[PDB]
mmCIF file of C-alpha atoms in Angstrom:
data_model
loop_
_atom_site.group_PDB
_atom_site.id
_atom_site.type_symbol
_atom_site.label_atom_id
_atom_site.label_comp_id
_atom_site.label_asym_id
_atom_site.label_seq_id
_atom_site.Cartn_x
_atom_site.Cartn_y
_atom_site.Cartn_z
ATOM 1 C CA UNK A 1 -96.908 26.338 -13.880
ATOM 2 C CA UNK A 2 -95.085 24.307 -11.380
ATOM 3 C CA UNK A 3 -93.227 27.870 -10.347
ATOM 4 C CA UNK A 4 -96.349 28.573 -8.031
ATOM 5 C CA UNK A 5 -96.594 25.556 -6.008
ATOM 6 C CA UNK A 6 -91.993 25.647 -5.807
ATOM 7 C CA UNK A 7 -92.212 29.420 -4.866
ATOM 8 C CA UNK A 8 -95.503 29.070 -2.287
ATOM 9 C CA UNK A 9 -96.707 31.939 -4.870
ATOM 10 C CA UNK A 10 -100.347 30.698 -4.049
ATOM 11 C CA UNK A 11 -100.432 28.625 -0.943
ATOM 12 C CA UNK A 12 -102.732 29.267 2.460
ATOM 13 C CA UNK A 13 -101.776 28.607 5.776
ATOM 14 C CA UNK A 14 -105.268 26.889 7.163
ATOM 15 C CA UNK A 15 -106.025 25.990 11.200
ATOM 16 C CA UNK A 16 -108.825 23.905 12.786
ATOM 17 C CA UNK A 17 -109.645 23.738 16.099
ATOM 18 C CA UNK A 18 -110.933 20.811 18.145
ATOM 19 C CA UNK A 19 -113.267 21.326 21.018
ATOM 20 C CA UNK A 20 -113.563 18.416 23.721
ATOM 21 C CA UNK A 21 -114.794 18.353 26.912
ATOM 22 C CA UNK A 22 -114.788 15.658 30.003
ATOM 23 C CA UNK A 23 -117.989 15.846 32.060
ATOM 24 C CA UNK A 24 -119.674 14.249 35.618
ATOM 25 C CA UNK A 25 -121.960 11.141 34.583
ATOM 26 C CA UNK A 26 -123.999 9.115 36.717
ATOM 27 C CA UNK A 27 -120.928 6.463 36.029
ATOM 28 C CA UNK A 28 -118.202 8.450 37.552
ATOM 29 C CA UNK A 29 -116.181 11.190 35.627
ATOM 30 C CA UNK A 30 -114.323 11.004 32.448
ATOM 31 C CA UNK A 31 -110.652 11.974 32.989
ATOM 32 C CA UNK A 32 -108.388 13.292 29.819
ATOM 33 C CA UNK A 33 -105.621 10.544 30.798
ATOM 34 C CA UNK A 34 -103.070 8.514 29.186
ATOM 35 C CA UNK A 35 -104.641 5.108 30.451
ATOM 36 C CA UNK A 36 -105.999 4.369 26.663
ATOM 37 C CA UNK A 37 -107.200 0.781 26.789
ATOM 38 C CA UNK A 38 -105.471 -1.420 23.531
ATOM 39 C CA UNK A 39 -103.339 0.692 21.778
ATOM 40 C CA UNK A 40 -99.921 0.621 20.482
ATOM 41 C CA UNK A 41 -97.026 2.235 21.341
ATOM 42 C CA UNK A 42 -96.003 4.234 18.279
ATOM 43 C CA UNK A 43 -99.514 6.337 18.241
ATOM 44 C CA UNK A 44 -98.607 6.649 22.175
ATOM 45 C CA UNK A 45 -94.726 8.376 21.013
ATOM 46 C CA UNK A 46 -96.352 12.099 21.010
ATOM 47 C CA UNK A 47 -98.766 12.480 23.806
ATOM 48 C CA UNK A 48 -97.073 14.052 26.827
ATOM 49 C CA UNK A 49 -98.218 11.967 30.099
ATOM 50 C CA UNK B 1 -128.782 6.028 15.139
ATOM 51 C CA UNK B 2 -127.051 3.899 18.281
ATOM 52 C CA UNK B 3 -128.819 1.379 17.831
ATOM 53 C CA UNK B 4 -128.378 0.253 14.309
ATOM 54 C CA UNK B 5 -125.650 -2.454 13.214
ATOM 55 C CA UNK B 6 -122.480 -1.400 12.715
ATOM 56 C CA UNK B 7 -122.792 -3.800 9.314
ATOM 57 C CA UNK B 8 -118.593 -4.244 9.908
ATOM 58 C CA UNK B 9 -118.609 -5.416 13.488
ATOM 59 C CA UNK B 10 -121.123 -8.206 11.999
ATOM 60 C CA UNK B 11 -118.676 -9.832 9.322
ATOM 61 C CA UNK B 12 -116.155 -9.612 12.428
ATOM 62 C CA UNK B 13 -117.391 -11.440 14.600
ATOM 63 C CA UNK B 14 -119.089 -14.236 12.288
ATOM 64 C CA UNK B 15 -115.353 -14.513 11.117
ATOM 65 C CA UNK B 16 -114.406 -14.408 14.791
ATOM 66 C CA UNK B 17 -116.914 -17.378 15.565
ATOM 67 C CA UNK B 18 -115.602 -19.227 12.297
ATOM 68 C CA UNK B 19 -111.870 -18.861 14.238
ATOM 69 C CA UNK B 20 -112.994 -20.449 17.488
ATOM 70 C CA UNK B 21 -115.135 -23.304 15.749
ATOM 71 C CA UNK B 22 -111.999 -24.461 14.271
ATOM 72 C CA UNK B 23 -109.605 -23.556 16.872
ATOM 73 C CA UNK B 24 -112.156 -26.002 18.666
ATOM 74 C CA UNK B 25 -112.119 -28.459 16.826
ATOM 75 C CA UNK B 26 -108.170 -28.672 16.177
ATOM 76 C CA UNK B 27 -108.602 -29.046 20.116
ATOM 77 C CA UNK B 28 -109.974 -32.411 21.551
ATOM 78 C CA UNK B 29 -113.526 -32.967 21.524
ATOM 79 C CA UNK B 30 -113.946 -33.241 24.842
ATOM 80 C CA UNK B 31 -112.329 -30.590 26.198
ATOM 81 C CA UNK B 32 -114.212 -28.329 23.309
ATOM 82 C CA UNK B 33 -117.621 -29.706 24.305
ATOM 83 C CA UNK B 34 -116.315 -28.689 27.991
ATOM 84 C CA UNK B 35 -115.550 -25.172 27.287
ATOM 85 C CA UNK B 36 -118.045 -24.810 25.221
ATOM 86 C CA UNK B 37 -120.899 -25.649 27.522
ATOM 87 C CA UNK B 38 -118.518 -23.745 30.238
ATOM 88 C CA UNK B 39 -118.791 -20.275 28.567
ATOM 89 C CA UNK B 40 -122.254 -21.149 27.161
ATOM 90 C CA UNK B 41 -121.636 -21.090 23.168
ATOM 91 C CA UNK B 42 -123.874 -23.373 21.396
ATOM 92 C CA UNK B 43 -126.455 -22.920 24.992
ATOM 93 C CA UNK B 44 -127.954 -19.674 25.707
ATOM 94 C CA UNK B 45 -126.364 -20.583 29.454
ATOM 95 C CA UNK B 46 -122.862 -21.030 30.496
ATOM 96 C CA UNK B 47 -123.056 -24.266 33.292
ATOM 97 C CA UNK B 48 -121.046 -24.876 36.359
ATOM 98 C CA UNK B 49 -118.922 -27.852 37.045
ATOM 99 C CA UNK B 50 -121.595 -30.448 38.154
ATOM 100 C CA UNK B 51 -123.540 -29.558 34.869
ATOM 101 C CA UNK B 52 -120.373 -31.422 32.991
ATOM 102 C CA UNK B 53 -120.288 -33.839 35.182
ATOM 103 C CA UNK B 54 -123.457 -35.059 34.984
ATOM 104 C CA UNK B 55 -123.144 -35.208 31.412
ATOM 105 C CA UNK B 56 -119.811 -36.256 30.846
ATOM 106 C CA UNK B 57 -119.711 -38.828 33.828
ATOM 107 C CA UNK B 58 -117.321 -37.612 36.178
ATOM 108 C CA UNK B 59 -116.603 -35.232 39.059
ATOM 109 C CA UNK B 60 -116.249 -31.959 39.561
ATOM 110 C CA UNK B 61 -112.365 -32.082 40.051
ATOM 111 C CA UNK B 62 -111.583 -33.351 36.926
ATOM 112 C CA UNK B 63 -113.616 -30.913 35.263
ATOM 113 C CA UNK B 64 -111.717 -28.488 37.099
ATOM 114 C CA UNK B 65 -108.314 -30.821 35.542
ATOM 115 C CA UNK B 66 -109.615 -31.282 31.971
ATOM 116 C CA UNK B 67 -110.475 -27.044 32.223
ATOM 117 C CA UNK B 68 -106.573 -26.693 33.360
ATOM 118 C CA UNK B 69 -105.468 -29.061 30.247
ATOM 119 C CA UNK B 70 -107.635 -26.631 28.219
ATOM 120 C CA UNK B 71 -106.204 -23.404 28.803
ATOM 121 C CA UNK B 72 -102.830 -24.651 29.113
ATOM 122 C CA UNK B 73 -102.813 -26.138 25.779
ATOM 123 C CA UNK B 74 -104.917 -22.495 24.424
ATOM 124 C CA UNK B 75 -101.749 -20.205 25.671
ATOM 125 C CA UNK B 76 -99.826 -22.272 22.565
ATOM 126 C CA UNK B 77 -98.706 -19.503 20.696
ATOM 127 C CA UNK B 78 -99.728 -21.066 17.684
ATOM 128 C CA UNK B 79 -103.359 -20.211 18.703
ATOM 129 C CA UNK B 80 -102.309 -17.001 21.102
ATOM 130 C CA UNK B 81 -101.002 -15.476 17.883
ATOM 131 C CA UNK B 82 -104.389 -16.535 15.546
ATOM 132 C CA UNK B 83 -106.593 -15.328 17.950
ATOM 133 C CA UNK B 84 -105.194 -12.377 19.388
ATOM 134 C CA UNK B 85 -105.037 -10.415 15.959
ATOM 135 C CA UNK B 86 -108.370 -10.410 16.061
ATOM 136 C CA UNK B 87 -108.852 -7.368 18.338
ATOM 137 C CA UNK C 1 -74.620 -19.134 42.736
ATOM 138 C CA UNK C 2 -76.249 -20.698 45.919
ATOM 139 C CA UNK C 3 -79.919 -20.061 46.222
ATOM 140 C CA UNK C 4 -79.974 -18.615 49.746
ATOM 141 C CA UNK C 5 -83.551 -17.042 51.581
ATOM 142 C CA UNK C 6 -83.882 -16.362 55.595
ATOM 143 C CA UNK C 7 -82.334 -19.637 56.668
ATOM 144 C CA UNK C 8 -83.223 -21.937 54.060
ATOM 145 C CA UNK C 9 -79.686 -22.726 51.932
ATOM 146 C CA UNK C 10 -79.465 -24.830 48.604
ATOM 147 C CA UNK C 11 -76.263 -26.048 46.364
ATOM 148 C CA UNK C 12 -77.742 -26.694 42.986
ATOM 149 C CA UNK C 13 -74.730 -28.722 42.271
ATOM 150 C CA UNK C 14 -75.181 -31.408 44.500
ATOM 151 C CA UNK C 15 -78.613 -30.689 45.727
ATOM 152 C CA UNK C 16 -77.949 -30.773 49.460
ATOM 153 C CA UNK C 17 -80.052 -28.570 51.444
ATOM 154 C CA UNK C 18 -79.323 -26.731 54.824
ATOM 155 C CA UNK C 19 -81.607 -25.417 57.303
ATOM 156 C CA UNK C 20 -80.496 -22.485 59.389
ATOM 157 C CA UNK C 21 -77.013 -24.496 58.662
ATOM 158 C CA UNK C 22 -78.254 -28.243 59.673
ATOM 159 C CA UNK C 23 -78.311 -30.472 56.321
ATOM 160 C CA UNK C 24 -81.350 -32.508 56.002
ATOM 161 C CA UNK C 25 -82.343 -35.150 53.310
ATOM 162 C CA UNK C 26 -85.268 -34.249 51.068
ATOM 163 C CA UNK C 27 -86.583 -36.194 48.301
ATOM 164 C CA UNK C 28 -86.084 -35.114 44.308
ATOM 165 C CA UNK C 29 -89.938 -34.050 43.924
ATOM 166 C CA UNK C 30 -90.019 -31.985 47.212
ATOM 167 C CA UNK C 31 -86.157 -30.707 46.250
ATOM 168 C CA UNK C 32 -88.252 -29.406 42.752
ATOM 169 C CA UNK C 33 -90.705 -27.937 44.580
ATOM 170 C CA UNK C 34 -88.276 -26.376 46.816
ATOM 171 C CA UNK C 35 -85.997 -25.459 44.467
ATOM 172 C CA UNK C 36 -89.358 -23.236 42.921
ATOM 173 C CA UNK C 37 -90.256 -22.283 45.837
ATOM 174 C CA UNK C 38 -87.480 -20.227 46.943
ATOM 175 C CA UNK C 39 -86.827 -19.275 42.828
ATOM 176 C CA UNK C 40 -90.445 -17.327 43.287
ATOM 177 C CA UNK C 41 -89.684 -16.359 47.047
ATOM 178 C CA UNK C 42 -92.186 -13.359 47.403
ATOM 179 C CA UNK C 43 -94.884 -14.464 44.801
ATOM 180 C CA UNK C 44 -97.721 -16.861 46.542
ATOM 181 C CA UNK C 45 -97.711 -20.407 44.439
ATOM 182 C CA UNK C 46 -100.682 -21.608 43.740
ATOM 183 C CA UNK C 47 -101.843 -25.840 42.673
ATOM 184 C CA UNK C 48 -102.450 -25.243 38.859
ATOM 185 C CA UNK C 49 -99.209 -23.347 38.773
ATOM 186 C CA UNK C 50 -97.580 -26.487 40.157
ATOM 187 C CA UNK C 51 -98.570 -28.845 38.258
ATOM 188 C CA UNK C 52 -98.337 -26.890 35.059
ATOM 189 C CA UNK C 53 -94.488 -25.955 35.665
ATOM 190 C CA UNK C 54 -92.647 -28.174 38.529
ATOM 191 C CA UNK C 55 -94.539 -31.796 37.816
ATOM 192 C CA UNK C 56 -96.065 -33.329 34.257
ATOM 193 C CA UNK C 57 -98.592 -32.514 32.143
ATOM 194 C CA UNK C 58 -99.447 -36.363 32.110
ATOM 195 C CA UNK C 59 -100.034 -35.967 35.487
ATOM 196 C CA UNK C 60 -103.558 -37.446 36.503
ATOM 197 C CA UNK C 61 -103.594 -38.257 40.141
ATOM 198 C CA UNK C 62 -105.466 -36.434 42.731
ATOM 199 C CA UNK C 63 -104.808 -33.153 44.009
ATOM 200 C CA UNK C 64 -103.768 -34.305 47.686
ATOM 201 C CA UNK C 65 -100.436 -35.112 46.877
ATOM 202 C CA UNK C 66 -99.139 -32.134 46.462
ATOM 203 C CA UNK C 67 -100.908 -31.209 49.754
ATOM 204 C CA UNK C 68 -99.047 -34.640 51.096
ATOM 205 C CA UNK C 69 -96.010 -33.099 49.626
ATOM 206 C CA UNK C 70 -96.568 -29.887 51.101
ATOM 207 C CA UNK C 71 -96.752 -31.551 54.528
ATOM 208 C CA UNK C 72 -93.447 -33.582 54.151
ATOM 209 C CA UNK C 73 -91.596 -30.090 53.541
ATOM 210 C CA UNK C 74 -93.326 -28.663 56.556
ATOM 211 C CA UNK C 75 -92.280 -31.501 58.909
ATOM 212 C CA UNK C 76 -88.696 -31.207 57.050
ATOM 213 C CA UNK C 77 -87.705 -27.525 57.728
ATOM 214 C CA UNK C 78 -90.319 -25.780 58.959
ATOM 215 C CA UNK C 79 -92.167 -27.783 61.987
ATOM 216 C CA UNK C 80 -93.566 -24.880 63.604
ATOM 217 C CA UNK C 81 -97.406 -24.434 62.910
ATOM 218 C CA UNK C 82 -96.720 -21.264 62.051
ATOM 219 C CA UNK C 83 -94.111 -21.065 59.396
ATOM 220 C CA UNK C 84 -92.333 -19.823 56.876
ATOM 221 C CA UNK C 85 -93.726 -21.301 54.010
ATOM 222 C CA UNK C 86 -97.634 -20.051 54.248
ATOM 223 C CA UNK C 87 -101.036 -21.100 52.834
ATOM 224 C CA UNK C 88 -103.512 -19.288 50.968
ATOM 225 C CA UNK C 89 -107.136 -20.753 50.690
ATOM 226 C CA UNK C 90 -107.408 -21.427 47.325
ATOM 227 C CA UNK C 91 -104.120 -19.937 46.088
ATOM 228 C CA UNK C 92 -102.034 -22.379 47.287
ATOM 229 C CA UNK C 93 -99.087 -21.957 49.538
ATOM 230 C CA UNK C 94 -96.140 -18.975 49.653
ATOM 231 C CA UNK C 95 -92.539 -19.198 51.219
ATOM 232 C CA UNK C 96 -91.684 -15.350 53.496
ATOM 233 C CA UNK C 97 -90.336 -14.235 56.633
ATOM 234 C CA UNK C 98 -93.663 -13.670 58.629
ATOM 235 C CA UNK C 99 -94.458 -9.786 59.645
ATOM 236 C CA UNK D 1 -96.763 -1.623 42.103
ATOM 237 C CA UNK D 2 -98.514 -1.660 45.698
ATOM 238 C CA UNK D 3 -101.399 -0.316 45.246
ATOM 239 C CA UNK D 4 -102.896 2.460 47.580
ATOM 240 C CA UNK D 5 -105.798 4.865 48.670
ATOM 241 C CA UNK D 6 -105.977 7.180 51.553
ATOM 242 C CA UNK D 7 -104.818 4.639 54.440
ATOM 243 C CA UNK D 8 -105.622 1.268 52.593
ATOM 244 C CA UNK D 9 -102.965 -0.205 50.610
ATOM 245 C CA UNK D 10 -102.900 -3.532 48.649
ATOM 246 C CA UNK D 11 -100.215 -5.962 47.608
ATOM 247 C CA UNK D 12 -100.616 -7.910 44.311
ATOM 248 C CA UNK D 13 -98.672 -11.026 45.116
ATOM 249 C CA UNK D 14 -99.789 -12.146 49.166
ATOM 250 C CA UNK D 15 -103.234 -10.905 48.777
ATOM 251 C CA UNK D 16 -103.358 -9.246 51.722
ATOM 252 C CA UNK D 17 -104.310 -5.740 52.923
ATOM 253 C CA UNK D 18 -103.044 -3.068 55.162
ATOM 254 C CA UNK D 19 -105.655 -0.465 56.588
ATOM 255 C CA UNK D 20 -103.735 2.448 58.151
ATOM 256 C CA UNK D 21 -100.558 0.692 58.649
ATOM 257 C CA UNK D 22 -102.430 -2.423 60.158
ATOM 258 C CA UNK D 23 -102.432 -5.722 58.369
ATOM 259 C CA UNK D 24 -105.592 -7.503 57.930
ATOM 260 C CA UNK D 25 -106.762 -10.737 57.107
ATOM 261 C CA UNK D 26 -109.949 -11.101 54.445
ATOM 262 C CA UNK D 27 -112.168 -13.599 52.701
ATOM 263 C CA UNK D 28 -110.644 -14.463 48.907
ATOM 264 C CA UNK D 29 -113.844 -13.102 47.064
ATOM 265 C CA UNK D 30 -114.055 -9.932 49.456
ATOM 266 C CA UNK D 31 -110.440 -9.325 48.644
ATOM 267 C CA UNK D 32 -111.902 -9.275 45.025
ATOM 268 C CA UNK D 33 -114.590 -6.725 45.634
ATOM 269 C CA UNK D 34 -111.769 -4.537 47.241
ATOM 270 C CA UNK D 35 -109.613 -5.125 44.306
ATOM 271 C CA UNK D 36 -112.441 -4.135 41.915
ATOM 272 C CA UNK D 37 -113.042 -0.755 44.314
ATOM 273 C CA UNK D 38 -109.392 0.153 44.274
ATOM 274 C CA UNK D 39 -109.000 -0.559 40.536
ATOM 275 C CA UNK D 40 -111.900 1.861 40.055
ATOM 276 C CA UNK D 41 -111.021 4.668 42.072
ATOM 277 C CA UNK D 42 -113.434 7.639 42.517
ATOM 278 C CA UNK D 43 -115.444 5.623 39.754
ATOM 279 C CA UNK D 44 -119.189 4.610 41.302
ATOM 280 C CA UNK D 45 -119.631 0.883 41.417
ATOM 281 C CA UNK D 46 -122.739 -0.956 40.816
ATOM 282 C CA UNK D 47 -124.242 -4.149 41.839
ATOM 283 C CA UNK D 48 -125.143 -5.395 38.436
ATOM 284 C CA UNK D 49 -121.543 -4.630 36.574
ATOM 285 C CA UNK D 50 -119.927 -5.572 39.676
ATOM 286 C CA UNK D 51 -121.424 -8.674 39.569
ATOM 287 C CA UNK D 52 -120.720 -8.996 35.615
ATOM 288 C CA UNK D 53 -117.139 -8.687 36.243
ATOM 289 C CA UNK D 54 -115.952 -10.013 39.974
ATOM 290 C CA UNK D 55 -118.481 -12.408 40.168
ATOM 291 C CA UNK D 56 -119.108 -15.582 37.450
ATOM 292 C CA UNK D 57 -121.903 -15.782 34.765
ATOM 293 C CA UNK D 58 -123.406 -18.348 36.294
ATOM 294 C CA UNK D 59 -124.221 -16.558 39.718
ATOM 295 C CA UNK D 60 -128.086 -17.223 40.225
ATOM 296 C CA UNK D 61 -128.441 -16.284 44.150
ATOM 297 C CA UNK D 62 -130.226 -13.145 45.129
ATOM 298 C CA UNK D 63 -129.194 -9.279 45.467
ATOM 299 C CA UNK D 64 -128.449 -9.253 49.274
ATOM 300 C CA UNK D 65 -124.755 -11.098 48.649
ATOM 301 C CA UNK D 66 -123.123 -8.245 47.513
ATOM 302 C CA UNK D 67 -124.900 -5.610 50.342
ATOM 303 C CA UNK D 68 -123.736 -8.281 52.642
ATOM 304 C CA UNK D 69 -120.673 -8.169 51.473
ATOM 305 C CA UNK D 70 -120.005 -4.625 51.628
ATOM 306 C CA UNK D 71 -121.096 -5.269 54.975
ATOM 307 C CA UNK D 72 -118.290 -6.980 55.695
ATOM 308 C CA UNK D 73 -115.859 -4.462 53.680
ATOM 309 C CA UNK D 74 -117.479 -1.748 56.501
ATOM 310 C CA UNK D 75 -116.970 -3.756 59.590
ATOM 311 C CA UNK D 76 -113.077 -4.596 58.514
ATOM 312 C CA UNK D 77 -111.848 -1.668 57.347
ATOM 313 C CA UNK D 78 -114.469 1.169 57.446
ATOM 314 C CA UNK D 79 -116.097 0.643 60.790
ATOM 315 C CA UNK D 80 -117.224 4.184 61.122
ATOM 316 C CA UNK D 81 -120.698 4.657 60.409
ATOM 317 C CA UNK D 82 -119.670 7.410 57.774
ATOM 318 C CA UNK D 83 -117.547 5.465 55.471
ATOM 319 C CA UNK D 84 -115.145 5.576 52.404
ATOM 320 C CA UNK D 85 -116.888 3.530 50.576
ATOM 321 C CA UNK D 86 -120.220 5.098 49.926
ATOM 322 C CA UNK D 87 -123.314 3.693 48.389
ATOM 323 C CA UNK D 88 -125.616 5.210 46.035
ATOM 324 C CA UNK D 89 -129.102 4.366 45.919
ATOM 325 C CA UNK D 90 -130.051 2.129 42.946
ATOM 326 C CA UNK D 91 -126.706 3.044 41.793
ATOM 327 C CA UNK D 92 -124.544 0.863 43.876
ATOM 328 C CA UNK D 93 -121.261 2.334 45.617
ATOM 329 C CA UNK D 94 -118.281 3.586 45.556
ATOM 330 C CA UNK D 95 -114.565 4.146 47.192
ATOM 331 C CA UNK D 96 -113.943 7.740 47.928
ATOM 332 C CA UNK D 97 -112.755 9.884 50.869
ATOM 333 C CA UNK D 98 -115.290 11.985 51.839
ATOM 334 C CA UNK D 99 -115.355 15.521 51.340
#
């Protein structure tokens, strides 16, 4: 019945985690920055600088 | 595998090449030939100046002039907009 | 509203122009390029630029008349070799105060 | 906008350069190789990608233009012997103060 999914009788709270890592190459380093080459602007709205 | 086709990227850019032959030809022929042979399209080579003139018949300046014409009349937004989607 | 830089003044009502407050006669083409010049004071001007914007896109004459041009403006205002309104080789030209 | 690095420092609209405090005068396409250093900060440069992007397609000289020219970047601005701009072997160089 509809009652469990309303009530969150039977519902699971679930988290993934995302590993990623920036390493030295023979072509520099990679740097976790902001400078994101062509993108937009409303993908941009929530990542802090 | 790296290496392999994408097999989407393909169909892009054949579409892509379909979009500047005709944004070519809606230009002027000679100022298509021009950039064409300047960037190397239908060649495996791009050419300098010289190369154009020899085979157009005139100097190197107006090259340079007929090149100006061409990416004056390219920033048209009716182009600008056609072509820029595609990226 | 007058367009004022260092000591170069201009009245885009009646298009007289005053340098370091003596009036001197310029032509209409050089009073265009002028008129640019000092409306992108800070930001070197380069040929195609010139052509494209201040004269006609039917222009086909050489590119030494703009250099001629160039030269009329120096011998109107500034005479000095060294002067206000620089070169760049192969960016064309740039009107500031020297450093 | 002025863009800078340890004690050289760039403008975008005169082209010109300032090396601790002290204005400089430098060749067009040498300004572009220092341009292409300071827009890839701490990122090594090499000779082949450097002369993919500065430098036209159609470039068919030799390898010793762009050693020369970093030549010339040394004896303007880095005269010391040890240098900012360090070069990697078979891997080109690099703008960097030295640790």
């Amino acid at each position: 019945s509809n009652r469990l999914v309303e009530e969150d009788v039977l519902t699971s709270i679930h988290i993934e985690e995302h590993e990623i890592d920036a390493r030295d190459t023979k072509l520099g380093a990679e740097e976790i920055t902001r400078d994101i080459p062509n993108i937009s602007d409303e993908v941009l709205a929530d990542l802090d600088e | 595998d790296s290496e392999a086709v994408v097999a989407v990227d393909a169909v892009s850019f054949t579409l892509l090449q379909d979009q500047l032959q005709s944004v070519l030809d809606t230009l002027s022929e000679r100022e298509a030939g021009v950039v064409r042979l300047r960037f190397g399209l239908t060649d495996g080579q791009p050419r300098t100046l010289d190369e154009i003139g020899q085979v157009y018949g005139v100097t190197r300046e107006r090259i340079r002039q007929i090149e100006s014409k061409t990416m004056s009349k390219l920033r048209h937004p009716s182009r600008s907009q056609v072509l820029r989607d595609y990226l | 509203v007058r367009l004022t830089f260092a000591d170069i003044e201009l009245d885009e009502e009646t298009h007289e122009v005053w340098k370091a407050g003596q009036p001197v006669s310029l032509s209409p083409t050089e009073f265009t390029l002028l008129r640019y010049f000092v409306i992108n004071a800070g930001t070197v001007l380069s040929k195609p630029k010139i052509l494209d914007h201040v004269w006609r896109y039917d222009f086909g004459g050489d590119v030494n008349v703009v250099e001629s041009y160039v030269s009329y403006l120096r011998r109107k205002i500034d005479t000095g070799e060294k002067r206000l309104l620089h070169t760049l080789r192969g960016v064309g030209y740039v009107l500031r105060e020297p450093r």
